[PDB]
Short mmCIF file of C-alpha atoms and ligand atoms in Angstrom, two decimals:
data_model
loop_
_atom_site.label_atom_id
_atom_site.label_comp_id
_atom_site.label_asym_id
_atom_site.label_seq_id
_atom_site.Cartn_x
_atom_site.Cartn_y
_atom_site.Cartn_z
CA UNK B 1 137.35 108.56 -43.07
CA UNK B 2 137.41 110.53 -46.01
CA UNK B 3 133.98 111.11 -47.26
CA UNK B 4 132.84 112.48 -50.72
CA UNK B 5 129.34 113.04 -52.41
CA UNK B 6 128.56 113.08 -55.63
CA UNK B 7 125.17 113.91 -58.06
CA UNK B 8 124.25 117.16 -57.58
CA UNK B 9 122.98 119.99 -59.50
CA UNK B 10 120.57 121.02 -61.36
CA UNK B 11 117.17 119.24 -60.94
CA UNK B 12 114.01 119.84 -62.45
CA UNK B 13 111.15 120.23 -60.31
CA UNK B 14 109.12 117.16 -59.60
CA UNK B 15 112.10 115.24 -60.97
CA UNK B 16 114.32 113.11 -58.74
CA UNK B 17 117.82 113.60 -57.38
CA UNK B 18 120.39 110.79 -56.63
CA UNK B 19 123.35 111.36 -54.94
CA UNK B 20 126.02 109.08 -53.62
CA UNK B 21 129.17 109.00 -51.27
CA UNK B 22 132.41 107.02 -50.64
CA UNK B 23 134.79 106.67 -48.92
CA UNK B 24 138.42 105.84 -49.55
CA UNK B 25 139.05 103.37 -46.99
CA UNK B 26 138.36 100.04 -45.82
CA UNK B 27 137.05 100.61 -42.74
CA UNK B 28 133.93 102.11 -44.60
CA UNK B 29 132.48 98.99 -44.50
CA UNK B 30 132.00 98.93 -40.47
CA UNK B 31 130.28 102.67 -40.22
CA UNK B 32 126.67 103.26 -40.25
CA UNK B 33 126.24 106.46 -42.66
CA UNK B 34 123.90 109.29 -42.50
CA UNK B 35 122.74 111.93 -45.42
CA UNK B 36 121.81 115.34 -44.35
CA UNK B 37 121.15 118.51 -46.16
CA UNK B 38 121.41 122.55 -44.82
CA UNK B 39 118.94 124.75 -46.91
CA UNK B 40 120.19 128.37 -46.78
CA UNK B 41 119.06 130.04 -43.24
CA UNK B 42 117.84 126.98 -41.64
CA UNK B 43 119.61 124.60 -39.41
CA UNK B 44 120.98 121.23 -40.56
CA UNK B 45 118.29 118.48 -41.35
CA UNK B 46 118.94 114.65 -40.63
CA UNK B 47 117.77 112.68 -43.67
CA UNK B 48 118.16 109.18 -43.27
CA UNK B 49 120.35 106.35 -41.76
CA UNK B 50 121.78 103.05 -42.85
CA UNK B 51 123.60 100.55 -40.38
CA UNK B 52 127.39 99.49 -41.18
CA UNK B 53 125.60 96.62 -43.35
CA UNK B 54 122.56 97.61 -45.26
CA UNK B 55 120.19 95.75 -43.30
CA UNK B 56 118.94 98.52 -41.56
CA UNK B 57 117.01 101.67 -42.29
CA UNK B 58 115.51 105.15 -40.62
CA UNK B 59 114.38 108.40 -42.70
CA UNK B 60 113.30 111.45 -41.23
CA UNK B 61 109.41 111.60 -40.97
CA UNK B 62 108.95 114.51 -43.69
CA UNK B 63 111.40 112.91 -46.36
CA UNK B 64 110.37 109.47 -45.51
CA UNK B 65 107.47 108.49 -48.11
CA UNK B 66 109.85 109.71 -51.26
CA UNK B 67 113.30 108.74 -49.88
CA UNK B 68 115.52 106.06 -50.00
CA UNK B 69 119.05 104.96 -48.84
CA UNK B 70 120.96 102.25 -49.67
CA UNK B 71 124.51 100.45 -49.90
CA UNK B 72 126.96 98.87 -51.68
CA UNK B 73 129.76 97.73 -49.32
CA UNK B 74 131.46 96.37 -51.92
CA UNK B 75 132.03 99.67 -53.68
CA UNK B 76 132.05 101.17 -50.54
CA UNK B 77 129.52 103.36 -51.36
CA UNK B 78 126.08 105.16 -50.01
CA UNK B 79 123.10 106.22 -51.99
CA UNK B 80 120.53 108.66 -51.28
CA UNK B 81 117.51 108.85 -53.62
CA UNK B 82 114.94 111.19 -53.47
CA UNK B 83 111.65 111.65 -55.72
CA UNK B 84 109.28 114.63 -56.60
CA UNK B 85 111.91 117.10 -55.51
CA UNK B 86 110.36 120.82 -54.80
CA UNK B 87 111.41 124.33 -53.96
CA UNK B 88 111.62 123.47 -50.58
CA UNK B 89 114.69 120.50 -51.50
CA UNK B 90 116.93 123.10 -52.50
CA UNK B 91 120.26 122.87 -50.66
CA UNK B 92 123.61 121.63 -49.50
CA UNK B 93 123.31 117.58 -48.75
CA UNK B 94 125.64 116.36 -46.56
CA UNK B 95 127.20 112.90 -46.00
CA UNK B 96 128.58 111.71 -42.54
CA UNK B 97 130.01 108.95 -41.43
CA UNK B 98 130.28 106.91 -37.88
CA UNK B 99 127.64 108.04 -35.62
CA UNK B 100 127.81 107.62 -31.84
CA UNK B 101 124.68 109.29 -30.82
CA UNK B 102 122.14 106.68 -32.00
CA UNK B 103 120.00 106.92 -34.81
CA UNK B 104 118.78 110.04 -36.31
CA UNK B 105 120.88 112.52 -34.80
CA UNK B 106 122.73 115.65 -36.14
CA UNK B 107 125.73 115.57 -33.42
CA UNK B 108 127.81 112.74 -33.05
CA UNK B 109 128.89 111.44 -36.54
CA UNK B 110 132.58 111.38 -36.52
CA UNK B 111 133.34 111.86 -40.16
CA UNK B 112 131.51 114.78 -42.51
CA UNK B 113 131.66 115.84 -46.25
CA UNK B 114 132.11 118.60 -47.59
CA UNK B 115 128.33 118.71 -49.00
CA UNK B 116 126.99 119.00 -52.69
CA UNK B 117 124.39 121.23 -54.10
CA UNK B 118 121.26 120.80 -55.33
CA UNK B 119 118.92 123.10 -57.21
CA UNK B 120 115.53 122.36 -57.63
CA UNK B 121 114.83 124.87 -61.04
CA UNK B 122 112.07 125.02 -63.41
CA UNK B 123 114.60 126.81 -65.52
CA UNK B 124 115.81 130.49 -66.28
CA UNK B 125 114.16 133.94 -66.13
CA UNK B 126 114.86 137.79 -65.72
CA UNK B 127 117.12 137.19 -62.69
CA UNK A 1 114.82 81.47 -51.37
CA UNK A 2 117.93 83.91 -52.69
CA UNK A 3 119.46 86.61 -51.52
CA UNK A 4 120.72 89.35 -53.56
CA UNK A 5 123.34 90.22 -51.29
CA UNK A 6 126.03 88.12 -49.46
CA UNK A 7 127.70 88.91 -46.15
CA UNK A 8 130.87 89.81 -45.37
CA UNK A 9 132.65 87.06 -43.59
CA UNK A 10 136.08 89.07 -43.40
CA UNK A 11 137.48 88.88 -39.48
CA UNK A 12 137.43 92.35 -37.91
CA UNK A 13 138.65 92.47 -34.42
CA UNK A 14 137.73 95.93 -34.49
CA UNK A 15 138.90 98.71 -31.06
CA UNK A 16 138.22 96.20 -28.51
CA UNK A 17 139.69 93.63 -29.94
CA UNK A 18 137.23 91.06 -30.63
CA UNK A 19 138.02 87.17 -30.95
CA UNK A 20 135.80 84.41 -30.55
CA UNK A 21 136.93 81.52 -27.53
CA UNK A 22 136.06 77.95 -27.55
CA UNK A 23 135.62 75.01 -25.09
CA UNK A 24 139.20 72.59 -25.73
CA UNK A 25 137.07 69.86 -25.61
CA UNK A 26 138.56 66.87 -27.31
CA UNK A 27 136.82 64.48 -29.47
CA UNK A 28 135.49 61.85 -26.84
CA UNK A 29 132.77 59.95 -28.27
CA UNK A 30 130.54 61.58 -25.27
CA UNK A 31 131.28 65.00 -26.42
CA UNK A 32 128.50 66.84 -28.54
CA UNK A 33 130.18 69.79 -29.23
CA UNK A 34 134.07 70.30 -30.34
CA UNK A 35 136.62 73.00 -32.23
CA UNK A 36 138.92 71.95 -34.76
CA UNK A 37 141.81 75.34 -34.15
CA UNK A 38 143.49 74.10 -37.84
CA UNK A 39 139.72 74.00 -39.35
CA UNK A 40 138.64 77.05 -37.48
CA UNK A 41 135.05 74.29 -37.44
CA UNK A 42 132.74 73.43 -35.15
CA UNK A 43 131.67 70.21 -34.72
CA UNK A 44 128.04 69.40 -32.86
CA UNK A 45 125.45 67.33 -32.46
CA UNK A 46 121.68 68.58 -34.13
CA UNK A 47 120.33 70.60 -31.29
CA UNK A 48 123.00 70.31 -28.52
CA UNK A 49 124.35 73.31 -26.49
CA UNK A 50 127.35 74.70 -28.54
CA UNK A 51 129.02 77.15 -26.49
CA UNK A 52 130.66 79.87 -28.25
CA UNK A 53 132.70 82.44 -26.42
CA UNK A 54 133.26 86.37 -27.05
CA UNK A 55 136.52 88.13 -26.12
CA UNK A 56 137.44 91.72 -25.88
CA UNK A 57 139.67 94.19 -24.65
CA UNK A 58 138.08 97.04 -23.80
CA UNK A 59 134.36 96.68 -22.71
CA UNK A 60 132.14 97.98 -25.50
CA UNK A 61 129.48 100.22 -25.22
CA UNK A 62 126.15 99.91 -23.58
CA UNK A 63 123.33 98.76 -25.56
CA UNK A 64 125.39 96.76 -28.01
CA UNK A 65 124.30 93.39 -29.58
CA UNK A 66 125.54 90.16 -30.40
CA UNK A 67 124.19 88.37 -33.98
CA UNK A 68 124.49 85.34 -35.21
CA UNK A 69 123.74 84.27 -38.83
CA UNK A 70 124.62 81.62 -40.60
CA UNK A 71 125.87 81.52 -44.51
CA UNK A 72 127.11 78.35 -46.80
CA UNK A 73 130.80 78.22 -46.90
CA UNK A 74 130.90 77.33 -50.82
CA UNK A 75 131.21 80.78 -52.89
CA UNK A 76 128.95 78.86 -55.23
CA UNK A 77 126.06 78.17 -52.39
CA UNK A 78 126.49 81.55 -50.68
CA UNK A 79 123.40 83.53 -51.94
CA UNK A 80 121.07 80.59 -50.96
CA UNK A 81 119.09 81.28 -47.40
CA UNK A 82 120.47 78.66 -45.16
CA UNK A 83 117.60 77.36 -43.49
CA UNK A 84 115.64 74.28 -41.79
CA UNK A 85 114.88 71.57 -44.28
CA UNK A 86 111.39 70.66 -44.28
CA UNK A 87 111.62 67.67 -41.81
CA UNK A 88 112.64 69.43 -38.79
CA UNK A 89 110.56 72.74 -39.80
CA UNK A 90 107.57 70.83 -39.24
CA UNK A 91 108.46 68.83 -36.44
CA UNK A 92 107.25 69.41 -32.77
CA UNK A 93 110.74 71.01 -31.38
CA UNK A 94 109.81 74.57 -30.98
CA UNK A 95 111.28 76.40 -27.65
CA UNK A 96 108.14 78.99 -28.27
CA UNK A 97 111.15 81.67 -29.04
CA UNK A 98 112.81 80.51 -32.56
CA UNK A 99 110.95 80.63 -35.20
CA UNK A 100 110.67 76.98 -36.57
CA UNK A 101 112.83 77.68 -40.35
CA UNK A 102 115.86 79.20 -37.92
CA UNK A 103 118.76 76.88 -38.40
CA UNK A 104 120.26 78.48 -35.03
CA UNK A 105 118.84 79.31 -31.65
CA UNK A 106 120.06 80.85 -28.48
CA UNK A 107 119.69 78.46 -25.31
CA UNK A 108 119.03 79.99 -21.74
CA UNK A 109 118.87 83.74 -23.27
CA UNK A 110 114.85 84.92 -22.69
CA UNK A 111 116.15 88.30 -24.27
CA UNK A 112 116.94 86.28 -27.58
CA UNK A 113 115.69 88.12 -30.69
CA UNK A 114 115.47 86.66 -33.92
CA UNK A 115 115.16 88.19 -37.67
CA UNK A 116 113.63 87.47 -41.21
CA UNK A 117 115.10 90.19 -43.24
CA UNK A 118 112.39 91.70 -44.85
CA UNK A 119 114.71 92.38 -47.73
CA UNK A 120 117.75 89.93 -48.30
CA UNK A 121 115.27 87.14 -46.31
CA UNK A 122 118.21 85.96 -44.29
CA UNK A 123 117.54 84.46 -40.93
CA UNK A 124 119.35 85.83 -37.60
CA UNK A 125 119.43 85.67 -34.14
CA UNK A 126 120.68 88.71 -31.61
CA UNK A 127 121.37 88.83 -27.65
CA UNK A 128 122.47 92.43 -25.67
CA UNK A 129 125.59 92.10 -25.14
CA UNK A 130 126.64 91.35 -21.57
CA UNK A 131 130.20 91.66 -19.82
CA UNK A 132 131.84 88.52 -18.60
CA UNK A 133 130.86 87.29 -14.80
CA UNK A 134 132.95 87.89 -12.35
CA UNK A 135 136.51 85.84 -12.10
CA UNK A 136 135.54 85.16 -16.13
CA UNK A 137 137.82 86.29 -18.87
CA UNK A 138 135.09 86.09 -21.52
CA UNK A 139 131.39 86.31 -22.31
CA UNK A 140 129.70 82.69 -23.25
CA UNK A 141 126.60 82.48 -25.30
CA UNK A 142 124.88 78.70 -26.23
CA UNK A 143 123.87 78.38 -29.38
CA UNK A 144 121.77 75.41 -30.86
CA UNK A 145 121.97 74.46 -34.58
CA UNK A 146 118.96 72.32 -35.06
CA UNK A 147 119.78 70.83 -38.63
CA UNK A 148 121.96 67.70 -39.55
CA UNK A 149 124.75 69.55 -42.24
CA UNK A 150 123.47 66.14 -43.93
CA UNK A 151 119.86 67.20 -43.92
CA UNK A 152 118.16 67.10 -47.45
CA UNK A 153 116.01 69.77 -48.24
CA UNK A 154 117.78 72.09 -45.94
CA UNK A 155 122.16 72.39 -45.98
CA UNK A 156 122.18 68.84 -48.15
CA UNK A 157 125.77 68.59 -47.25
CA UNK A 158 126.82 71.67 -47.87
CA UNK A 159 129.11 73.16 -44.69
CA UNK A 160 128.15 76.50 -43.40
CA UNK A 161 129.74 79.86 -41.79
CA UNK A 162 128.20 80.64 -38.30
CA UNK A 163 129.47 84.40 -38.63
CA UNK A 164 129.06 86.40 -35.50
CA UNK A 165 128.81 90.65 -35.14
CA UNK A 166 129.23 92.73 -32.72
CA UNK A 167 126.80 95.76 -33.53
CA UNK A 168 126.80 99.07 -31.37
CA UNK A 169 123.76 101.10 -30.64
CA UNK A 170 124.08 103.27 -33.46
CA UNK A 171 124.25 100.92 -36.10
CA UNK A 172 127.81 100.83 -36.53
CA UNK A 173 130.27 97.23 -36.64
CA UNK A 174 132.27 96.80 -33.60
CA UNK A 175 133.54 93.23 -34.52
CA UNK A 176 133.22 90.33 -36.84
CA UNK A 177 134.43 86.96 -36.52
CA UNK A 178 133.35 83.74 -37.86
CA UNK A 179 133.73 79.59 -37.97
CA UNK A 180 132.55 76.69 -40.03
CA UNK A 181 129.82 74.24 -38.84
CA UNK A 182 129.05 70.82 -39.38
CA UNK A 183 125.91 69.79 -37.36
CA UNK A 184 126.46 65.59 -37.28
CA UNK A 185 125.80 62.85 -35.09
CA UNK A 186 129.76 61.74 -34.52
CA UNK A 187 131.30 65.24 -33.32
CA UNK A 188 134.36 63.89 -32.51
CA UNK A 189 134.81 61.00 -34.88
CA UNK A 190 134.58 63.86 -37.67
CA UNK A 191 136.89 66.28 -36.36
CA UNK A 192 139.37 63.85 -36.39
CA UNK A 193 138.77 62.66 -39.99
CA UNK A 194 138.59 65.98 -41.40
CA UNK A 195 142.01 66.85 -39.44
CA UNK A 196 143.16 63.77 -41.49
CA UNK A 197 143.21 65.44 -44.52
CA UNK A 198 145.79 67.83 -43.26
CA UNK A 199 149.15 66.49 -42.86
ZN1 LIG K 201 116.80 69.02 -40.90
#
């Protein structure tokens, strides 16, 4: 119901990111959650799925061989972990909550959060 | 072998209010399947029809499923896989749908589908969901346990949780609900007993 991610920020490249959400409320535990992320100018990207259990899985073909999500009901909390991270991984990742459109879908998930950042960097410079 | 992870077995009726029914069947000596209310247990004979019976509100959407898994009731027992001891996995009774370590089966369901988790290596077993017939109140599905609870090498007299979810098309929880088991060859006989012990 109310959704909040944590774990991002800087990230070097070809290091990993890990982020996680919760939620506040019991009824976590019954909702299927989804992780998305927005890169600046493109359209929202679907990430991965996990049923209201754990059990069950579905990533998004181009994040699929680096990325995984997982569970713990009992913290009520969802983790998304993703490996060799490049320019391209740069963005806002979103966590939502409840989806009634199936699997793998941007419209549809009743609950949102507010998003985190992430920067992929290979450090500073002259701008 | 283990699991890592146990199941919830916390009731959730959920929006469309989800309970579980059962037969009032007495404990005759004939009868091979009977539900203690005080116990919340079932009582059933090894591979008799066990009908169990889902109630709802509100119809729930299209494409949702019905699962059945089973867990050991002891905290202590609850990561162990409850499965077939080695007896019945090898005998001759397969249906050609269950696979033969599956404690239960669906009866007179060809849509039946069953599950080794590939990761927590728990055993299930999942029908669609289908409204009640007409002039019916509820939605019946016959299960088949097809251990003894007394069976050595499998539940060694351990009693189990049948616990059954309701699971939408988008991989969300509708409903949970769930009930004890003992699979014996006295249904009736050990309701009563085990109602004894109260009062
Ligand atoms: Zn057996």
């Amino acid at each position: 119901v109310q959704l909040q991610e944590s774990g991002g920020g800087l990230v070097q490249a070809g290091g990993s990111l890990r982020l996680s959400c919760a939620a506040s409320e019991r009824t976590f535990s019954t909702y299927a959650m989804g992780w998305f992320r927005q890169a600046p100018g493109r359209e929202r990207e679907f990430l991965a799925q996990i049923n209201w259990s754990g059990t069950t899985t579905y990533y998004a073909e181009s994040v699929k061989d680096r990325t995984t999500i997982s569970r713990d009901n009992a913290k009520n909390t969802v983790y998304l972990e993703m490996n060799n991270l490049n320019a391209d991984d740069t963005g806002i990742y979103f966590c939502a909550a409840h989806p009634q459109r199936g699997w793998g879908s941007t419209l549809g998930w009743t609950y949102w959060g507010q998003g985190t950042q992430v920067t992929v960097s290979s450090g500073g410079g002259g701008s | 072998p283990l699991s890592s992870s146990v199941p919830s077995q916390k009731t959730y009726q959920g929006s469309y209010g989800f309970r579980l029914g059962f037969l009032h069947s007495g404990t005759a000596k004939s009868v091979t399947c009977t539900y203690s209310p005080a116990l919340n247990k079932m009582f059933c004979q090894l591979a008799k029809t066990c009908p169990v019976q889902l109630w709802v509100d509100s119809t729930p959407p299209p494409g949702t499923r019905v699962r059945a898994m089973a867990i050991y009731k002891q905290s202590q027992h609850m990561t162990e896989v409850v499965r077939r001891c080695p007896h019945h996995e090898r005998c001759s009774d397969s249906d050609g749908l269950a696979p033969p370590q599956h404690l239960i089966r669906v009866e007179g369901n060809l849509r039946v589908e069953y599950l080794d988790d590939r990761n927590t290596f728990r055993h299930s077993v999942v029908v669609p969901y289908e409204p009640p017939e007409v002039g019916s109140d509820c939605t019946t599905i016959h299960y088949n346990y097809m251990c003894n609870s007394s069976c050595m090498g499998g539940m060694n007299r351990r009693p189990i949780l049948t616990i059954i979810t309701l699971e939408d098309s988008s991989g969300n929880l509708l409903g949970r609900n769930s009930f004890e088991v003992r699979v014996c060859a006295c249904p009736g006989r050990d309701r009563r007993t085990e109602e004894e012990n109260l009062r």
